[PDB]
Amino acid sequence: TVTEPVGSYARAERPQDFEGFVWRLDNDGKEALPRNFRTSADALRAPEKKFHLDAAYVPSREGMDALHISGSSAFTPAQLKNVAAKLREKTAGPIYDVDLRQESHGYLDGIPVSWYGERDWANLGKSQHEALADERHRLHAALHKTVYIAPLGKHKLPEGGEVRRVQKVQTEQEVAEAAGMRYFRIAATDHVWPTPENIDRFLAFYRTLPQDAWLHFHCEAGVGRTTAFMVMTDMLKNPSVSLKDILYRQHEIGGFYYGEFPIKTKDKDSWKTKYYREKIVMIEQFYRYVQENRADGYQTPWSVWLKSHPAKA
Amino acid sequence: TVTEPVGSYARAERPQDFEGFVWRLDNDGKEALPRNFRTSADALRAPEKKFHLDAAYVPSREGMDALHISGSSAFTPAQLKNVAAKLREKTAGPIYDVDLRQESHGYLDGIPVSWYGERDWANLGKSQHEALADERHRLHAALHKTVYIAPLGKHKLPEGGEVRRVQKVQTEQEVAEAAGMRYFRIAATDHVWPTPENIDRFLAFYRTLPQDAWLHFHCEAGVGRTTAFMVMTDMLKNPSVSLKDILYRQHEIGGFYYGEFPIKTKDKDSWKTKYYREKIVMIEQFYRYVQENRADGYQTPWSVWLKSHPAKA
């Protein structure tokens, strides 16, 4: 009798210990595009040293040209318009802004902000419905009120920033639609493997997509959650490609490396260690799911399959 | 007809532009006593060069022995106890904690904090009734809630600090009583000359004090507001002492110098200039009030006298 199965470790954490306390600045808006911007059409670059990978290995690019996905960090409204314009040059299909952020976020006077709590876990434990309700309520409450917006600096605490009286409030959905993109929200908790609910919702969405749909995934930094869903998409759409190639190529186009590697964090970040290990095992488990259920058209969803085929540490 | 008379310049500022946005740390509690602690029993020291005074001048100390007043910056509960113990060695009369802070402040888990707005004007324009209501509501709303407490750094904006879930909330009144001091609040706005309302309340308070009462004044830093009331008390209790002596000696025991001096401010602090000039003028006007109204025992209140005898720029 296990309390939390692998893939659900974050459920053991106490939400009350990571409550939001400040409007974090999501992007300073100085660059034309969000950070870590990349597409499946991009050329593969040398792997990052920290993953101790084979720099000589050349992964197959089979299916990358038809993949039609991209990823990035959070963005200002102008930056998102730039992304959309760039993605429109690559396709005539619907372009989706796939928001993977569980944390409450939006735009105050056009400034991309998020309600930040320790570890960015201000909405930990909330259902997607409660997180989005908190988001709507917090954004609305900011209108015509004085707010402190700051970037995090030394030790993930506010540093400098600015104070203003908000005259306009927008949700990311509004910002996406103003950029001509369709919007899809998946409330994934920062730093950890996406929940079975997060993944079931994604696979359900994925099967409704027209052939030429282009998915632009993003989280806060554009690394952890963004690459997890990019990899999942790659595996679903190109089930013939080996796990190694999927992981290598999503990393080499600019994303995270979701395969095994020597995990090393700063003392102050030791809490991330088991979550990285968990991600590695779940990635392999998701690959198994795709391989075992593609043939029948996914009659059984990921959550159900995972419960009868639990992952092991 | 004049919109704002001299002594009421701050009434021209818009309170909506300085609303509170963070719980400022009023004292890190590392020292045994609050900053700028001083008593009227202290020896006089050399003046500060910035005031360009006569270091050779020997101010009269007539009445200082019996003046019985002290001043300091804000403090932690432990620091206030230390102040009270110190003062109790000088008197057998009641010891008053004279809180001159208009800004909402209190103690979260024993930590001295204040709801800080730009220029520390989060309660600008509020009656004392409204200011105290804001304070009570905010303090109480913090209980069992997550808060961000931080000291101000570069450009008067949060820098570092800590996040915590508050388990205890106290007003300065409770902290004062626990330290064996009586409490008297005067909601004076930071950086400016106390209002006719502030001074009227102070004078009425002063009139019914026991002969052996000891007044410990304080504000946030313990300089501007603290010295203003210490000076007023000195003039009230020792009317035969010259203005020059009062100003010099209140300055030489560790307070601000309230006489004419070469005002010099940084560009980002150029807004303080006229408030410093206003204070200089109002100090002279108050002294005049004391000299012309003492004979009949101050039958006419400061506010009323000031209206029929407006100060001049």
d(CA A105, CA B239): 61
Touching check for A270 and chain B: CB below 8 Å?
no
**Beta-sheet strand order (sheet of B38-39):** B38-39, B69-72, B214-218, B95-101, B182-188
As annotated, the binding site of B for 1D-myo-inositol hexakisphosphate includes 24, 156, 191, 220-225, 272, 276, 279
- Give dist(CA A234, CA A250) in Å, integer: 8
What is the distance between the alpha carbons of residues B185 and B102, in angstroms, rounded to a whole number? 9
Give the DSSP letter string of B114-177.
Answer: EEE-GGG-TTTT--HHHHHHHHHHHHHHHTTSEEEEE-B-GGG-BBS-EEEE---EE-HHHHHH
DSSP code string of A224-282? HHHHHHHHHHHHHH-TTS-HHHHHHHHHHTTS---S-------GGGGGGHHHHHHHHHH
Place of tokens 């930094």: A221
**Which H/E stretch holds residue B236?**
helix B224-237
Sign for the CA dihedral angle at B174, B179, B184, B187 comes to: negative
A99, β-bridge pairs = A185, A218
In angstroms, the CA A87 to CA B50 distance is 62
Question: Burial, B93: exposed, middle or buried (Cβ in 10 Å; 0-12, 13-18, 19+)?
Answer: middle
Name every residue whose Cβ is closer than 8 Å to that of residue A134 and which is 6 or more positions away in sequence: A104, A115, A123, A126
Find, among A156, A192, A189, the residue nearest to A272 by Cα: A192
Name A38's bridge partners.
A71
- In chain B, residues with a C-beta closer than 8 Å to the C-beta of A19 are 145-146, 165
Mark yes or no for CB contact B158/A154 under 8 Å.
no
Which CA distances in Å does A272 have to A19, A119, A156, B70, B77? 18, 10, 15, 52, 38
Judge: A117–B146 Cβ closer than 8 Å, yes or no: yes
Determine, for residues A157 and B150 on separate chains, whether the beta-carbon distance falls below 8 Å.
yes
Q: What gap in Å lies between CA B309 and CA A299, rounded to an integer?
A: 90
CB contact under 8 A, A160 and B157: yes
What is the token pair recorded at A280? 């590695």
As beta bridge partners, residue B162 has B149
Contacts of A122 (CB under 8 A, 6+ apart): A18, A19, A20, A103, A104, A115, A116
**Residues composing chain A:** 313
Is A290 annotated in a binding site? The answer is no
Nearest-CB residue to A16 (from B118, B155, B165): B165
Q: Cα torsion for A249, A250, A252, A256, to the nearest 10°?
A: -140
Asked if the Cβ–Cβ distance from B163 to A118 is below 8 Å, we say: yes
- Chain B nearest-CA residue for A18: B146
- B160 and A CB contact within 8 Å: yes
The helix (H) or strand (E) run that includes residue A39 is strand A38-39
d(CA B176, CA A190): 44
Residue A168, amino acid: K
Q: Report how far residue A141's alpha carbon sits from residue A126's, in angstroms, rounded to the nearest whole number.
A: 20
- Residue given tokens 């540490």 in the structure block: A313
Q: How many CB atoms lie within 10 A of CB B2?
A: 7
Query: Phi, psi (5° rounding) for residue A98?
Result: -100, 95
**β-pair type (B182-188, B95-101):** parallel
3-state helix, strand, coil in chain A (%, to 5): 40, 20, 40
Technique employed here was: X-ray
CA distance B284 to B235: 11
A36-70 b/e with 16+ CB inside 10 Å = b? bbbbbeeebeebeeebebeeeeebebebbeebbbb
Tell me how far apart the alpha carbons of residues A216 and A95 are, in angstroms, rounded to a whole number. 7
Query: Quick check: B159 contacting A, CB < 8 Å?
Result: yes
Q: Kindly determine whether residue B21 and residue A147, on different chains, have CB atoms separated by under 8 Å.
A: yes
Q: Indicate yes or no: CB of A150 within 8 angstroms of CB of B161.
A: no
H-helix or E-strand containing A87?
helix A77-88
Report whether A133 contacts A6 (CB < 8 A).
no
As a residue count, chain B comes to 313
Helix axis angle, B243-252 to B224-237, nearest 10°: 140
Residues 6+ apart with CB under 8 A from A66: A237
Reduce the DSSP state of residue A214 to 3 states and report it. strand
CA distance to partner chain B, nearest, from residue A106 (Å)? 19
Q: Are strands B22-25 and B169-170 parallel, antiparallel or unpaired?
A: unpaired
User: CA–CA separation, A282 vs A276, rounded Å?
Assistant: 10
Going along chain A from its start, the domains and CATH numbers come out as 1-28+103-170 (3.30.70.1690), 29-102+171-313 (3.90.190.10)
- 8-state DSSP, B108: E
Spatial separation of the C-alpha atoms in residues A74 and A101, rounded to whole Å: 10
Q: How far apart are CA A140 and CA A126, in angstroms?
A: 19
Q: Given strand A69-72, what is the order of strands in its sheet?
A: A38-39, A69-72, A214-218, A95-101, A182-188
Query: Which B residues, 2 through 31, put their C-beta within 8 Å of a C-beta on chain A?
Result: 16-17, 19-22
A142 close to B (CB below 8 A): no
